[PDB]
RNA sequence: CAUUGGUGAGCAGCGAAGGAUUUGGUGGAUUACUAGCUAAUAGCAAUCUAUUUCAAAGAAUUCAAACUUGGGGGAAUGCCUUGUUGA
């Protein structure tokens, strides 16, 4: 027999992300 | 060391506890306002904790006859059969023929 | 060009035009904001359904797009429009007379960049607002600092700083004050794209030859360079699952994945988007997943995934090639012929000039499919013969359908271009049907028709002949000859009784059909260019050649109405469902609605872009027209 | 942050040989052994019978 | 449907019921699947009955007792509409408590319905068993819990617990505490021996949909799609009561010890895996084991329940337990 | 997906944990030497005694193994378990297992290896956990009863399905099975990684280097049709060819030579790629055997390329390199060989390079042209190079001498090229 | 003479750098498209907790409660209902 290549159902786990909207700040 | 320096980014003063997303930067349960340099250093470390640091950024940079050459030109070229050369000699076992 | 009966609704069958789309996380999940000319559409990135559509058509095309959590910013001609859930929430007019090229939003600041190298900064009035509105300042790029501006970026952890990648160098501005804190050394090429990496400090710059420069901004020095030779780089995205990968998307359609730990080339994907219409205009790795979304100006949007390895321990030395998860699309080229399939006004066939016949959906725009052309095994026990490298059928220039036998034999006839037979198509299975219908005197099929009962298909040729074929059996039944010049329209009554044919010798011939007599011969002035029959009332309309519409009562066999008033040739036209109006679109860029009782024009629209087909729905809610440029179908309501 | 859980070794609770009777661990928490007097009364009544 | 977990007392096997017909009995460590039934009446709950060899499921109306393979043994007629099942396993009594509001104790070893009690206060909303005691706490829509026993027509004791109905009760292993949770967004820790409430939490943000007291006195509460766990709430000191937040670094409040919110689900029930430290949550789309690093007890006993119990050890042992079954009639308070 | 299939993948996860006394005799009775019942009766302390004795024998034969006595074969290694350990710890244990399997892949016809690796099999379940490194190590013994044994115990990974058919059999696997293993592709990626690791830790030998050679040859032969398969199999074999050259074992270098030769005669590679092939070959050439093989190889590669640019000069650097590595008397005795490989294209490329870069050894040029029988267009190119050389240089005696050699053979071509340029 | 029954060896005819049966896997459709989570007029999405507790409001059938049973005879002891003796 050869090698089997069959596709498995892809489901989207989540991941974190940075934020610009913290990244900017304010003078005094 | 870097190649630029930001006078207002050091003289600024920023709060923390006003936003859920960044209450977790603090080291004490006292501090509420940090200046810009320590804010930026905390924030860099959090970026590290979000997206961990790899090998390709950090450990490796690009900086008679060599040894690397076969691998290098393989990296460069993408379709390695010589076709473009006006080969003058009809190559064997696969004919190229079009019906008119 | 305000009208009194019809009003515009939306434009079906557009997915992207080539502006780089924008993406937006929303929580744990992703959406995709693409722009189609003067609108933007928003797709569930997991399954690609049409969530939202921009509410009102913007005054000009959209130059730039960007998205964030709930808001999406489009920068058309001069202004920036902030929209939430589609509806316009803020206008933001930039105090200049030059168009807005690029646009980047980070923190408190929105940053818009015009074309005469200037950067406008809009700052939130208070950070408990949700999008910025105070004008802050206006940073400018003098020609000695850099070339033209190419993109705006904001790398992580950079407080109040803006990375402006110009055509020769990269600048760093301190946008709160606005002192140019940093300039990079001049790159010896043209910079074409830029994109920030999920490592710190590092922006990946793609030049105009195959050279991607990983450039470290805190130090200001290159750390890596990667040479594709002879390609034009047009996209860069950094796979951030944890496997250090890169997708460079060239402007020829190649999409080349690099493995940056092991300095290798993982893969190529070749012709995923067309070389002509732009190649790969955007190609992004969704943040956290092995999913890439690519989109190109051939009106298509695609999604490719990465399966995990086959090997247990060896892991990330055996990398599986990336396969194809899912996609939507439309025509690449403008459409050629449209026709409503069914009498709920659900589905619409439409053939387009890239030879492809889609069937669109008016309700849900995921139900729309392309009708495949995979031939059937020849019924004779022989071999069907064509070039082994396959290509689509010639452009489908006439098309007629009946829904009365759907499921039991074929029910579309199509007539291709510079081609001498018709092809029966299917509509249930959505596939090429098993019969091809010749014309039997060497004459290019000029028009086709189908009986009401769905048994017979008439194929008028261009040397006058009429051949009639059974559709269950594809087999030739009858063949009349009355015309001598081309035959440009065929029709049959709903009692299978009287047949009408109109041909360029200015003849309308009426036949009986149960028996085979010739029942009359009417002669007009000019050549006859199109016939539309209307069945319930037995009236039909012949678009003549002398710029006139002539309505004829197909029973008493005489001309009943004559609609003058056009000024150039008449492209296409259609009776109402109730037999009362004619809509007719003509090459002076007008569409007119005529009333047949009073015999006179009661409406007219002047269109900026010539209309080339016009078709009512059968259940008479809508009017679908199609235009000379722009891939879509324009849908219109019915105030009557 | 000292996360430690229960890690039972199989080689502690089942013998690697084949000819060796699988060991019984014990624990005398009366909470684990609930019905003292009813259980023993029924062993007395069974023994009588 | 939404699912429902039951770990076999031994620790090894698991039984999941759906809500449409999907019942399955598995081994979960070796992955091997014992049985699988696609019966289409809405099942509610299930239990193992003594081994992995027998189980009993509620159904639309009756109770069906199946084999280890799902060949139906019996159709229990007299248990009409049993929304709740339990098995009290030294006395061998299958206990159902209904929607009729009748409580039936059934001896699954000889096949003879021991007792048929009338709980008059309406359809039983919750049910748990004192394990040290084998006495059934049924919690009733008045807001009152009631302790029964098979040889007594009247409730042994009534315990006015909540205002409005009683969602779920769960009793300690040591037989000495009871946490109950109620639809007026409440949760109360009672001291069953001496029958005094220790201490009570009176405003949860959404009703306590379930509770469970582990094999180490640790408490798990579940409120919709949230699962919260408090450690050392089953003490008498007033300084134990489960708070949700520490008012600025106050070392007397008992902030939770673990937490997990599922996002779209809604947790149906929950149990603790017996001798490993996990708790199994059963929800609308499956099963999950959350690793809870204090939860179960480490060092079990082997003359009662091995988790490594072979085949011969099983069949010898069960005839020993049958031979020594306590009468139905013992069960005092 | 079904409850059955999710449970199946659970059991695969917890595949080596003894949850029962029955399962524990299944696991523990799989073993390399003994039969089932005897193996399942004995215990870890006995197997360790046998293993320590055998590793002392192997340390005598090969002295690298004392480190493994320090770290995987101790009394502490009696005690340790594999399933009770966190993932960092498991990764390290698999590093030590992989390094052991390398540094005794070469001794697998020896009862001491049988006994020592049998302790690794039973205490650490290498036949379940890292089988891919087990099989890629002991692969080339594919007839010896030892490999039949190893198949009989192992559970075959997803890339070894050909043997999945052959498992548990008295016949061995056959050569065409091994070729079809390699003729799938993702296996070629895997095997290449194993060889890079093998090279970098320096444990190669003629037996297995022959076997890998014979399989890369045979893969190119079976793919000799599907030009897309060939064009996509270029980077993998040419990566191995480069790394295997950059090694310092003459056996490595001969294997890389034969791979390059077969691959370039099966596919027409570009000129720049044959040039860099020569660059790497020469630039790490030392040994005598490799010198002879490398000469044959470069002649064959240049004979393969054909088109335009057919017969040009080597560049300066490659020419100078070739001169350092090879004397003109060495190339002259090579042309004095009896067998005489067809080497005309390289000879005339070399000659044009001499006459454009050295301008002295023209006596040597006449020697070379006396030795070999070139072709007409090579004559034309050489004669025109010499014409230009004459018109840039003093009409020297040896340049004259070359000219009357061609006058001896083909006055008329001299006349024709003269009509191209001159009188 | 048939065969409307197999198994084959061959033509005519069809016929563009091949053709014909069989089968695994994934994607999209199958109802008519308004985005994610939470304690929800809002925040989060890099985080809910070192304001997450308070106050208020909130306690009939003083127990309606198996509308839920295959048929026929019954019921020691149970259970149940009505009476009753002694506290």
Q: D10 and chain F: CB distance < 8 Å anywhere?
A: yes
Measured between alpha carbons, how far is F343 from C184 in angstroms, rounded to an integer?
Answer: 54
Chain A and chain B share a number of CB contacts under 8 A equal to: 23
Measured between alpha carbons, how far is C638 from C620 in angstroms, rounded to an integer?
Answer: 8
Q: DSSP letters of E82-101?
A: --EEEEETTTTEEEEE-SSS
- Do chains F and A touch by CB distance (3+ pairs < 8 Å)? yes
Beta carbons of F305 and F269 less than 8 angstroms apart: yes
Measured between alpha carbons, how far is C55 from B1 in angstroms, rounded to an integer?
Answer: 51
Beta carbons of C203 and C153 less than 8 angstroms apart: yes
Measured between alpha carbons, how far is C120 from C140 in angstroms, rounded to an integer?
Answer: 9
The answer to whether the Cβ–Cβ distance between B51 and A18 falls below 8 Å is yes
Beta carbons of C533 and C582 less than 8 angstroms apart: no
H-run or E-run covering C73 = strand C71-76
Three-state secondary-structure class, residue E234: coil
Measured between alpha carbons, how far is C412 from F404 in angstroms, rounded to an integer?
Answer: 84
Measured between alpha carbons, how far is E305 from C155 in angstroms, rounded to an integer?
Answer: 60
Chain A nearest C-alpha distance from C159 (Å): 5
Chain A nearest C-alpha distance from F218 (Å): 17
What separation, in Å, do the N-terminal and C-terminal C-alpha atoms of chain D show? 59
Beta carbons of C286 and C45 less than 8 angstroms apart: yes
Q: Where are the alpha helices (DSSP H) in C583-635?
A: none
Which nucleotide lies at the shortest CA–C1' distance from E249?
G50
Beta carbons of E61 and E80 less than 8 angstroms apart: yes
Question: Among residues C376, C418, C373, which one has the least CA distance to residue C395?
Answer: C418
Cα-to-chain-centroid distance, residue E80: 20
- Residue F88 — φ and ψ, nearest 5°? -60, -45
2-21 on A, CB < 7 Å from strand G: 5-10, 16-19
- Residue C493 — φ and ψ, nearest 5°? -70, 160
- What is Dmax (Cα atoms) for chain E? 60
Q: F176 and chain A: CB distance < 8 Å anywhere?
A: no
H-run or E-run covering E15 = strand E14-17
Beta carbons of F280 and F246 less than 8 angstroms apart: yes
Beta carbons of C149 and C191 less than 8 angstroms apart: no
Question: Which region holds residue C402: left if phi is over 0, alpha if psi is between -120 and 50, else beta?
Answer: beta
> Which of the other chains make 3 or more beta carbon contacts under 8 angstroms with chain F?
A, B, C, D, E
Best to test chain B binding among C124, C156, C209 (most B CBs inside 10 Å) = C156
Three-state secondary-structure class, residue C370: strand
Q: What contacts 24+ positions apart, CB below 8 Å, involve E53-56?
A: E54/E108, E55/E15, E55/E25, E56/E85, E56/E87, E56/E94, E56/E108
Classify residue E271 by its DSSP letter. Answer: E
H-run or E-run covering F385 = helix F376-392
CB atoms within 10 A of CB F266: 15
Measured between alpha carbons, how far is E56 from E70 in angstroms, rounded to an integer?
Answer: 10
CB atoms within 10 A of CB F142: 18
Question: Which region holds residue C477: left if phi is over 0, alpha if psi is between -120 and 50, else beta?
Answer: alpha
Question: Among residues F158, E13, F264, which one has the least CA distance to residue C311?
Answer: F158
Measured between alpha carbons, how far is F352 from F135 in angstroms, rounded to an integer?
Answer: 51
Q: DSSP letters of B30-94?
A: S--EEEHHHHHHHHHHHHHHHS---STTTT-------SSHHHHHHHH-S--B--TT---S--SS-
Which nucleotide lies at the shortest CA–C1' distance from E142?
G59
Beta carbons of F128 and F155 less than 8 angstroms apart: yes
Q: F156 and chain C: CB distance < 8 Å anywhere?
A: no
H-run or E-run covering F382 = helix F376-392
What separation, in Å, do the N-terminal and C-terminal C-alpha atoms of chain E show? 38
CB atoms within 10 A of CB A7: 11
Chain A nearest C-alpha distance from B51 (Å): 8
Beta carbons of C193 and C203 less than 8 angstroms apart: no
Residue E156 CA distance to nucleotide G87 C1' (Å): 23
Q: DSSP letters of E134-147?
A: TEEEEEETTTEEEE
The answer to whether the Cβ–Cβ distance between C311 and F133 falls below 8 Å is no
Beta carbons of C499 and C490 less than 8 angstroms apart: yes
CB atoms within 10 A of CB E42: 15
Burial of residue C128 (number of CB atoms within 10 Å: 0-12, 13-18, 19+): exposed
Pairing, β C356-361 against β C134-140:
unpaired
Measured between alpha carbons, how far is E273 from E280 in angstroms, rounded to an integer?
Answer: 6
Q: Indicate if the alpha-carbon torsion angle F70, F71, F73, F74 is positive or negative.
A: positive
- Residue C421 — φ and ψ, nearest 5°? -150, 175
Chain F nearest C-alpha distance from B68 (Å): 7
Strand G: list positions under 7 Å from protein Cβ.
Answer: 13-21, 24-40, 43-56, 58-59, 63-70, 79-80
Q: Indicate if the alpha-carbon torsion angle F314, F317, F323, F325 is positive or negative.
A: negative
Tell me how the structure was determined: cryo-EM
Angle of helix F87-103 versus helix F186-200 axis, rounded to 10: 80
What separation, in Å, do the N-terminal and C-terminal C-alpha atoms of chain F show? 87
Burial of residue C449 (number of CB atoms within 10 Å: 0-12, 13-18, 19+): buried
Q: DSSP letters of F70-121?
A: HHTSSHHHHH--SSSS-HHHHHHHHHHHHHHHHHTSTT-SSHHHHHHHHHHH
Pairing, β C412-415 against β C398-401:
antiparallel
- Residue C451: CB partners within 8 Å, gap ≥ 6? C402, C457, C458, C492, C496
Question: Among residues C159, C141, C163, C140, which one has the least CA distance to residue C151?
Answer: C163
Q: DSSP letters of D1-42?
A: ---------HHHHS-SSSSSPPP------TTTS--HHHHHHH
- Residue E315: CB partners within 8 Å, gap ≥ 6? none
Measured between alpha carbons, how far is C278 from E263 in angstroms, rounded to an integer?
Answer: 41
Measured between alpha carbons, how far is C166 from C194 in angstroms, rounded to an integer?
Answer: 10
Measured between alpha carbons, how far is F399 from F384 in angstroms, rounded to an integer?
Answer: 12
Which residue in A17, A22, A28 is closest to B12 by CB distance?
Answer: A28
The answer to whether the Cβ–Cβ distance between C222 and B36 falls below 8 Å is no
Which nucleotide lies at the shortest CA–C1' distance from C344?
G32
Cα angle for residues E308, E312, E316 (degrees, 5° grid): 105
Measured between alpha carbons, how far is F354 from F361 in angstroms, rounded to an integer?
Answer: 7
Angle of helix F316-325 versus helix F344-357 axis, rounded to 10: 110
Angle of helix F206-222 versus helix F250-266 axis, rounded to 10: 10
For B15, C86, C530, C568, C638, the CA distances from C604, given in Å and listed in that order, are 63, 31, 21, 15, 14
CA atoms within 13 A on the CB side of C212: 28
Which residue in B11, B21, B50 is closest to A22 by CB distance?
Answer: B21
Amino acid whose CA is nearest the C1' of G39 = E205
Classify residue F194 by its DSSP letter. Answer: H
Pairing, β C22-26 against β C8-12:
unpaired
H-run or E-run covering F29 = helix F21-29
Q: Where are the alpha helices (DSSP H) in F247-343?
A: 250-266, 271-283, 288-304, 316-325, 328-335
H-run or E-run covering F133 = helix F131-137
**Cα Rg, chain B, nearest whole Å:** 29
- Residue E127: CB partners within 8 Å, gap ≥ 6? E84, E86, E95, E97, E136, E137, E138, E139, E169
- Residue B52 — φ and ψ, nearest 5°? -65, 155
Q: Give me the torsion for CA of E120, E121, E123, E125, rounded to 10°.
A: -130
Classify residue C77 by its DSSP letter. Answer: S
H-run or E-run covering C140 = strand C134-140
Measured between alpha carbons, how far is F416 from F423 in angstroms, rounded to an integer?
Answer: 10
The answer to whether the Cβ–Cβ distance between F161 and A1 falls below 8 Å is yes
Measured between alpha carbons, how far is B46 from A18 in angstroms, rounded to an integer?
Answer: 9
Classify residue F250 by its DSSP letter. Answer: H
- Number of helices and strands in chain F (H, E): 25, 0
Cα angle for residues E281, E283, E285 (degrees, 5° grid): 125
Measured between alpha carbons, how far is C295 from C279 in angstroms, rounded to an integer?
Answer: 9
Beta carbons of C476 and C517 less than 8 angstroms apart: no
| Count, residues in chain A | 28
Burial of residue C466 (number of CB atoms within 10 Å: 0-12, 13-18, 19+): buried
For C347, C387, C393, C498, F56, the CA distances from C414, given in Å and listed in that order, are 17, 21, 10, 23, 85
Beta carbons of E45 and E39 less than 8 angstroms apart: no
Q: DSSP letters of C480-549?
A: EE--SS-EEEEEE-TTS-EEEEEETTTEEEEEESSS--EEEEEE-SS-EEEEEEETTTTEEEEEESSS-E
Chain E hits for F20, Cβ within 8 Å: 30, 308, 310
Measured between alpha carbons, how far is C507 from C501 in angstroms, rounded to an integer?
Answer: 8
Q: F186 and chain A: CB distance < 8 Å anywhere?
A: yes
Describe chain E by its helix, strand, coil percentages, rounded to 5.
Answer: 5, 40, 55
Measured between alpha carbons, how far is C488 from C501 in angstroms, rounded to an integer?
Answer: 8
- Residue E219: CB partners within 8 Å, gap ≥ 6? E179, E211, E212, E213, E229, E230, E231, E233, E234, E242
Measured between alpha carbons, how far is C133 from C135 in angstroms, rounded to an integer?
Answer: 6
Strand partners, E17: E4, E23
Which residue in C181, C200, C261 is closest to B56 by CB distance?
Answer: C261
**Cα Rg, chain E, nearest whole Å:** 19
Measured between alpha carbons, how far is C327 from C350 in angstroms, rounded to an integer?
Answer: 19
Chain B residues within 8 Å of chain C (Cβ atoms): 1-4, 6, 8-9, 12, 36, 39-40, 43-44, 47-48, 51-58, 60-62, 75-78, 99
Chain F nearest C-alpha distance from B78 (Å): 9
Residue A14 CA distance to nucleotide G37 C1' (Å): 12
Measured between alpha carbons, how far is C486 from C364 in angstroms, rounded to an integer?
Answer: 41
Measured between alpha carbons, how far is C387 from C531 in angstroms, rounded to an integer?
Answer: 36
Chain F residues within 8 Å of chain E (Cβ atoms): 3-4, 7-14, 17, 19-23
| Count, residues in chain D | 49
Q: F360 and chain A: CB distance < 8 Å anywhere?
A: no
Strand partners, D25: none
Measured between alpha carbons, how far is E228 from C555 in angstroms, rounded to an integer?
Answer: 82
Best to test chain F binding among E33, E298, E314 (most F CBs inside 10 Å) = E33
For C55, C59, E66, F78, the CA distances from C88, given in Å and listed in that order, are 7, 13, 62, 72
| Count, residues in chain F | 423
Question: Among residues C239, C248, C245, which one has the least CA distance to residue C261?
Answer: C245
Measured between alpha carbons, how far is E58 from E73 in angstroms, rounded to an integer?
Answer: 14
- Strands of C398-401's sheet, edge to edge? C398-401, C412-415, C421-425, C432-438
User: Is strand G less than 7 A from the beta carbon of E116?
Assistant: yes
CB atoms within 10 A of CB B5: 9
Cα angle for residues E176, E182, E185 (degrees, 5° grid): 125
């Amino acid at each position: 027999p050869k090698v089997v290549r069959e596709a498995k159902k892809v489901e989207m786990t989540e991941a974190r992300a940075y934020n610009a909207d913290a990244d900017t700040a304010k003078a005094a | 060391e870097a190649a630029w320096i930001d006078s207002d980014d050091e003289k600024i003063k920023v709060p923390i506890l006003v936003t859920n997303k960044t209450k977790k930067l603090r080291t004490s349960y006292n501090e509420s306002k940090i200046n810009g340099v320590h804010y930026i250093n905390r924030l860099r470390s959090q970026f590290e904790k979000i997206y961990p640091r790899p090998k390709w950024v950090d450990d490796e940079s690009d900086s008679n006859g060599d040894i690397n050459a076969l691998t290098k030109i393989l990296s460069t070229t993408y379709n390695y059969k010589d076709t473009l050369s006006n080969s003058k000699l009809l190559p064997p076992k696969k004919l190229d023929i079009v019906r008119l | 060009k305000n009208s009194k009966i019809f009003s515009p609704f939306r434009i079906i069958g557009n997915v992207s035009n080539g502006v780089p789309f924008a993406t937006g996380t929303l929580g744990s999940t992703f959406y995709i904001v693409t722009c189609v000319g003067k609108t933007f559409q928003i797709y569930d990135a997991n399954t690609l359904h049409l969530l939202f559509v921009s509410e009102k058509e913007t005054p000009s095309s959209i130059v730039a797009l960007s998205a964030h959590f709930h808001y999406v910013y489009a920068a058309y001609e001069n202004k920036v429009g902030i929209y939430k859930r589609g509806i316009e929430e803020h206008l933001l007019e930039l105090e200049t007379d030059a168009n807005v090229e690029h646009l980047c939003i980070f923190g408190d600041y929105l940053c818009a960049s015009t074309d005469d190298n200037s950067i406008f900064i809009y700052k939130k009035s208070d950070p408990q607002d949700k999008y910025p509105s105070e004008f802050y300042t206006k940073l400018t790029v003098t020609e000695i600092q850099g070339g033209e501006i190419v993109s705006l970026q904001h790398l992580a952890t950079y407080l109040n700083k803006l990375t402006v990648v110009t055509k020769s160098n990269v600048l760093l501005f301190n946008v709160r004050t606005g002192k140019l804190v940093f300039t990079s050394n001049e790159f010896p090429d043209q910079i074409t794209t830029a994109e920030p990496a999920p490592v710190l400090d590092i922006i990946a710059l793609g030049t105009v030859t195959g050279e991607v420069i990983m450039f470290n901004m805190r130090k200001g020095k290159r750390i890596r360079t990667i040479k594709i030779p002879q390609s034009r780089i047009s996209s860069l995205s950094f796979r951030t699952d944890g496997s250090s990968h890169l997708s460079v998307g060239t402007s020829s359609g190649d999409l080349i994945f690099y493995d940056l730990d092991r300095r290798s080339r993982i893969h190529v994907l070749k012709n995923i988007h067309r070389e002509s219409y732009g190649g790969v205009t955007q190609a992004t790795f969704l943040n956290g997943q092995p999913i890439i979304v690519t989109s190109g100006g051939d009106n298509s949007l695609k999604e490719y995934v990465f399966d995990p390895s086959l090997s247990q321990g060896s892991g990330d030395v055996v990398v599986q090639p990336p396969r194809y998860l899912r996609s939507r699309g439309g025509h690449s080229q403008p459409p050629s012929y449209i026709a409503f399939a069914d009498s709920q006004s659900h589905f619409m066939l439409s053939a387009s000039k890239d030879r492809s016949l889609w069937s669109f959906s008016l309700r849900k725009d995921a139900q729309s499919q392309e009708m495949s052309q995979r031939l059937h095994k020849k019924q004779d026990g022989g071999r069907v013969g064509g070039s082994t490298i396959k290509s689509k059928f010639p452009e489908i220039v006439a098309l007629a359908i009946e829904n009365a036998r759907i499921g039991e034999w074929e029910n579309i006839i199509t007539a291709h271009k510079d081609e001498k037979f018709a092809r029966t198509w299917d509509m249930r299975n959505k596939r090429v049907g098993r019969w091809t219908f010749d014309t039997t005197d060497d004459g290019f099929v000029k028009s086709v028709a189908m009986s009401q009962c769905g048994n017979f298909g008439f194929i008028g040729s261009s040397n006058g002949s009429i051949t009639i074929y059974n559709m269950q059996s594809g087999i030739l039944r009858k063949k009349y000859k009355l015309h001598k010049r081309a035959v440009t329209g065929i029709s049959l009554d709903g009692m299978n009784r009287k047949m009408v044919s109109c041909g360029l010798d200015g003849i309308v011939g009426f036949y009986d059909f149960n028996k085979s007599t010739l029942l009359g011969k009417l002669k007009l002035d000019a050549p006859i260019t199109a016939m539309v029959y209307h069945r319930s009332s037995d009236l039909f309309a012949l678009a003549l050649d002398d710029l006139s519409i002539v309505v004829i009562d197909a029973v008493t066999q005489r001309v009943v109405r004559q609609l003058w008033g056009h000024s150039n040739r008449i492209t296409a036209f259609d009776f109402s469902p109730e037999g009362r109006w004619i809509v007719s679109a003509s090459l002076d860029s007008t569409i007119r609605t005529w009333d047949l009782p009073t015999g006179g024009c009661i409406d007219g629209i002047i269109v900026d872009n010539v209309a080339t087909n016009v078709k009512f729905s059968p259940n008479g809610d809508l009017l679908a027209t199609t235009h000379v440029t722009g891939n879509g179908i324009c849908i219109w309501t019915n105030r009557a | 942050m000292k996360i430690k859980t229960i890690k039972r070794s199989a080689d502690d609770y089942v013998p690697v040989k084949s000819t060796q009777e699988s060991q019984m661990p014990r624990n005398l928490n009366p909470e684990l052994h609930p019905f003292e007097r009813a259980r023993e009364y029924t062993k007395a009544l069974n023994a009588t019978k | 449907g939404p699912y429902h977990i039951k770990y076999a007392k031994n620790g090894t096997h698991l039984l999941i019921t759906g809500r449409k017909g999907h019942v399955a009995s598995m081994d979960w460590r070796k992955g091997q699947l014992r049985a699988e039934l696609f019966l289409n009446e809405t099942c509610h709950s299930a239990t193992y009955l003594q081994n992995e060899q027998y189980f009993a499921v509620a159904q639309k109306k009756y109770t069906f007792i199946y084999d280890h393979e799902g060949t139906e043994l019996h159709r229990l007629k007299q248990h009409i509409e049993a929304r709740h099942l339990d098995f009290l396993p030294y006395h061998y009594l299958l206990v159902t408590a209904g929607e009729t509001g009748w409580l039936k104790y059934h001896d699954v070893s000889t096949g003879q319905l021991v007792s048929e009690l009338r709980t008059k206060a309406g359809p039983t909303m919750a049910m748990a068993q004192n394990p040290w005691n084998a006495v059934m706490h049924l919690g009733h829509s008045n807001g009152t819990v009631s302790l029964w026993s098979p040889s007594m027509p009247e409730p042994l004791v009534k315990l006015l617990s909540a205002r409005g109905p009683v969602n779920s009760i769960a009793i300690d292993r040591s037989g000495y505490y009871m946490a109950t949770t109620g639809a007026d967004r409440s949760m109360k820790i009672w001291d069953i021996r001496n029958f005094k409430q220790l201490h009570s939490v009176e405003s949860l943000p959404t009703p306590g949909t379930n509770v469970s007291i582990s094999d180490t006195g640790l408490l798990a509460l579940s409120r919709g799609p949230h699962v919260t766990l408090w450690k050392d709430a089953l003490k008498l000191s007033g300084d134990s009561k489960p708070c949700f937040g520490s008012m600025g670094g106050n070392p007397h409040r008992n902030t939770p010890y673990m937490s997990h919110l599922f996002a779209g689900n809604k947790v149906e029930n929950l149990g603790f895996v017996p001798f490993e430290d996990l708790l199994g949550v059963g929800h609308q789309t499956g099963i999950t084991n959350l690793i809870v690093p204090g939860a179960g007890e480490a060092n079990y006993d082997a003359l009662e329940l091995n988790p490594f119990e072979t085949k011969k050890q099983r069949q010898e042992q069960e005839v020993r337990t049958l031979l020594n079954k306590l009468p139905a009639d013992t069960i005092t308070l | 997906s079904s409850l059955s299939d999710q449970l199946a993948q659970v059991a695969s996860n917890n595949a080596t944990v003894a949850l029962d006394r029955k399962r524990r005799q299944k696991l523990h009775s799989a073993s390399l030497i003994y039969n089932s019942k005897t193996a399942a009766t004995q215990d870890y302390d006995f197997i360790f005694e046998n293993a320590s004795k055998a590793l002392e024998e192997l340390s005598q034969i090969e002295p690298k193994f004392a480190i493994f006595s320090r770290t995987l074969f101790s009394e502490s290694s009696i005690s340790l378990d594999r399933n009770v350990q966190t993932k960092e710890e498991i990764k390290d244990l698999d590093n030590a297992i992989n390094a052991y399997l390398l540094l005794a892949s070469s001794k697998w016809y020896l009862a001491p290896t049988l006994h020592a690796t049998e302790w690794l099999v039973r205490r650490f379940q290498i036949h379940v956990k890292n089988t891919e490194m087990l099989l890629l190590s002991t692969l080339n013994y594919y007839q010896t009863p030892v490999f039949k044994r190893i198949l009989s115990i192992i559970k075959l990974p997803p890339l070894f399905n050909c043997l999945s058919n052959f498992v548990r059999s008295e016949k061995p696997p056959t050569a065409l099975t091994m070729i079809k293993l390699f003729n799938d592709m993702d296996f070629l990626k895997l095997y290449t990684s194993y060889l890079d690791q093998c090279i970098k830790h320096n444990a190669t030998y003629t037996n297995q280097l022959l076997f890998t050679t014979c399989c890369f040859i045979n893969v190119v032969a079976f793919n000799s049709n599907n030009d897309e398969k060939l064009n996509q199999l270029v980077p993998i074999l040419l990566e191995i060819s480069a790394k295997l050259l950059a090694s310092k074992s003459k056996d490595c270098q001969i294997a890389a030579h034969t791979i390059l030769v077969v691959f370039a005669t099966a596919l027409p590679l570009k000129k720049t790629i044959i040039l860099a092939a020569m660059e790497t070959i020469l630039s790490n050439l030392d040994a005598k055997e490799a010198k002879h093989s490398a000469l044959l190889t470069i002649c064959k590669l240049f004979q393969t390329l054909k088109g335009q640019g057919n017969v040009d000069q080597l560049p300066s650097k490659i020419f100078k390199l070739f001169d350092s590595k090879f004397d003109t008397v060495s190339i002259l005795t090579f042309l004095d060989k009896e067998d005489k490989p067809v080497c005309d294209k390289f000879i005339t490329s070399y000659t044009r390079s001499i006459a454009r870069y050295d301008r002295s050894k023209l006596n040597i040029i006449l020697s070379l042209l006396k030795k070999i029988r070139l072709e007409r267009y090579e004559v034309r190119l050489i004669i025109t190079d010499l014409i230009y050389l004459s018109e840039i240089l003093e009409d020297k005696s040896q340049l004259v001498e070359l000219f009357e050699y061609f006058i001896s053979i083909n006055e008329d071509l001299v006349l024709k090229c003269l009509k191209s340029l001159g009188l």
